[PDB]
């Protein structure tokens, strides 16, 4: 063999590994500074992952693939020899592109507030691709508009007349030398502001009142390892911009806000007028985690880094949240479990083939009990019927069109989805409605079992035209009990329908003289009878869980029983 091996004297099939370097790797991490001290040299903060634990790297989808195996002509690897190094050079870019590592002329990058020390081979391409399509300008005007719309809803708590956004020349975002005014405020009588201080300072209101005029500035930097202290940067740019002639401000009594795009740090330094510092704190904390332009920034950074993460996501509804279902907000549960349903039959050749059945979209209110059943007829499945996957898109489209037709009073605040694959299409189809929070559930609910009821099934199977049908699963319960008592009752009923589906029907209908009404779903019982049937269905859930898991239900604790019945441990 032409290859030379250094392990010429052994083989792992026979001798074994003979060296192990995990202590070396462990205190290599501990010698470099720990993971925290290592990842500040990186663009980890620019990716905005909460933790570093489940981060997996992905060299399986780069340019070194099906093309670059057999490209041939090895003079290809003369200009494009630095292309495997791009991702690496992106990742450690806050330490490659420092002032103290390259003594150089330090040009500015193209349409950015990024400065490139020296001529790093693949860094400029990566920065052009991440700030493709004027992303600095769009990040700046999205933060100005967000801070204005924050000030567009706190008028009669402070002393105002009208906030006003200047339409300055667009080429001020990527201008480090000087700026103009990102918003101007217009106070009613006067503001005895304080003095200049920081965004995370405590106290001390004082000097002059400065009628009608108040400016903020917004400086977006691209920090490196040496300089990413955002507070010192903010105060330095304040003291330089307020005391020079190239940059002239309406009043001398305003604040600038400095945002480091590379590290997702933010701060401010200026004259804070009373009741604005604890407003701007909450505002900027909200904006740094919901801004759609910073989202494009973060996803383009992760995109270019090819770096993934299972274990953190958006924070789910998982277990400890669920008491927040019953607030004064409009919350929806959406279930598309039964949308693309299929029935299989044999042909004359014998081979099994698949014919669809009519489906439904299950929208439930966990705060009133109002139900939206959207029956999805077969005649929208004319166009694939072999694989599916457009179920997700037709479901998201119908939910978006339903919210579009719904008035603005009953529009949801949160939409909580049972199947996590819907979290991404709705997030597209609800870009028209930005205030809707879309949250996943680790707590799986038996909302598929609701179509096991004969009324729902006979409605869906016999239909020939898509229709929106209304219900209330709290039939007359809210006259006597609460929304969460009715909800836990409904979860007990639907879980017992999912488990046995017939013994629950026998126990809920033990007598012919016990009746149910055509306006309602479940039989009319007094509250003592409801206590009886709730204990009975609780027993149906727990006994069959213990049978399916070879355990006794007389040993289970209250939290374990709650996790069995309500959700999943």
């Amino acid at each position: 063999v032409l290859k030379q091996n250094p392990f010429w004297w052994t083989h792992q099939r026979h001798d074994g590994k003979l060296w192990n370097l995990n202590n070396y790797r462990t205190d290599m991490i501990q010698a470099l500074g720990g993971v925290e001290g290592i990842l500040e040299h990186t663009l980890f903060k620019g990716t905005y992952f909460p933790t570093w634990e489940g981060l997996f790297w992905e060299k399986a989808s780069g340019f070194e693939e099906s093309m670059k195996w057999k490209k041939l002509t090895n003079a290809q690897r003369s200009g494009l020899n630095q292309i495997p190094n791009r991702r690496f050079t992106l990742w450690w870019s806050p330490t490659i592109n420092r002032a103290n590592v390259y003594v150089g002329f330090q040009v500015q990058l193209d349409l950015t507030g990024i400065f490139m020390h020296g001529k790093i081979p693949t860094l400029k391409i990566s920065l052009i691709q991440i700030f493709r399509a004027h992303l600095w300008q769009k990040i700046h005007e999205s933060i100005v508009m967000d801070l204005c719309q924050v000030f567009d809803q706190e008028l009669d708590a402070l002393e105002i007349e009208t906030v006003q956004k200047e339409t300055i020349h667009p080429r001020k975002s990527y201008k480090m030398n000087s700026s103009c005014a990102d918003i101007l405020l217009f106070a009613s009588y006067k503001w005895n502001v304080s003095r200049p201080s920081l965004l995370a300072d405590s106290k001390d209101v004082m000097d002059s009142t400065t009628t009608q005029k108040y400016w903020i500035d917004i400086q977006l930097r691209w920090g490196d390892y040496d300089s990413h202290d955002i507070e010192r940067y903010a105060r330095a740019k304040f003291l330089d911009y307020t005391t020079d002639n190239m940059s002239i401000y309406p009043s001398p009594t305003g604040v600038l806000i400095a945002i480091d795009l590379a590290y997702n740090l933010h701060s401010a330094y200026g004259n804070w007028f009373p009741g604005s510092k604890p407003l701007i704190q909450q505002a900027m904390a909200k904006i740094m985690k919901a801004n759609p332009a910073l989202y494009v920034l973060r996803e383009r950074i992760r995109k270019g880094l090819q770096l993934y993460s299972s274990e953190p996501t958006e924070p789910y509804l998982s277990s400890q949240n669920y008491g927040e279902l019953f607030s004064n907000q409009i919350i929806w549960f959406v279930d598309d479990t039964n949308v693309y349903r299929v029935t299989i039959h044999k042909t004359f050749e014998g081979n099994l083939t698949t014919k669809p059945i009519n489906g439904a979209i299950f929208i439930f209110n966990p705060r009133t009990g109002q139900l939206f059943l959207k029956i999805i007829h077969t005649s929208v499945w004319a166009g694939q019927k072999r694989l599916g996957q457009l179920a997700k898109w037709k479901t998201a489209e119908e939910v978006a069109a339903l919210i579009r037709s719904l008035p603005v009073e009953e529009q949801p605040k949160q939409i909580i989805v049972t199947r996590k694959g819907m979290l991404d299409p709705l997030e597209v189809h609800l870009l028209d409605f930005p205030n809707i929070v879309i949250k996943g559930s680790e707590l799986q609910l038996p909302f598929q079992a609701c179509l096991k009821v004969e009324k729902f099934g006979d409605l869906i199977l016999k239909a020939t035209e898509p229709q929106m049908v209304l219900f209330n699963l709290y039939d007359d319960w809210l006259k006597t009990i609460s929304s969460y008592t009715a909800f836990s009752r409904l979860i007990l009923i639907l879980r017992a329908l999912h488990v046995n589906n017939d013994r629950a029907k026998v126990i809920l209908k033990p007598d012919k003289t016990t009746i149910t009404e055509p306006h309602h779903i479940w039989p009319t019982l007094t509250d003592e009878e409801w206590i009886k049937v709730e204990v009975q269905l609780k027993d149906l859930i727990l006994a069959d869980y213990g049978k399916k898991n070879n355990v006794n239900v007389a040993s289970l604790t209250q939290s374990e029983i709650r996790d069995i019945i309500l959700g999943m441990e």
Binding site: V103, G104, F105, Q106
Partner: protein, 167 residues
Amino acid sequence: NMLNLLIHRKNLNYLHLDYNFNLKPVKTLTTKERKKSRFGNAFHLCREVLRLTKLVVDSHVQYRLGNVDAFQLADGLQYIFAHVGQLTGMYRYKYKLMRQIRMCKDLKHLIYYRFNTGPVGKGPGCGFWAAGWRVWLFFMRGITPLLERWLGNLLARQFEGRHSKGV
């Protein structure tokens, strides 16, 4: 005027030399225009030397306009001479200048430690530009013949023409 008369005699209307001696293309160039407009170390050495002198002379102009100060002028000149390799970029077109650049860094370490001794802290405030001034004039003492020869052969090739297989 000399540098952009050299630009305009070569018909390179798509380049622009600004007033601080930064050479940038006006538009996006074809391959033929990019090969035509590549300059050498003579042009860029003269351009960066003129950048350093315009930095010095503009410091003096803002002193003489009444804009800055006497002390801030002295500290600005001391920065300029401590940071030629960070303000100009002369090193890219002649690399041996690192010999000068490191030397100025050494003088900045020598002076500041003697300057910032007692009550005086680590602020900017130090214009003692005699040392860096000497270092960058002794550089010019030897770069004068090299650049005069290089610019002379540049002009002689522009006005006489290139001899193909003469040499």
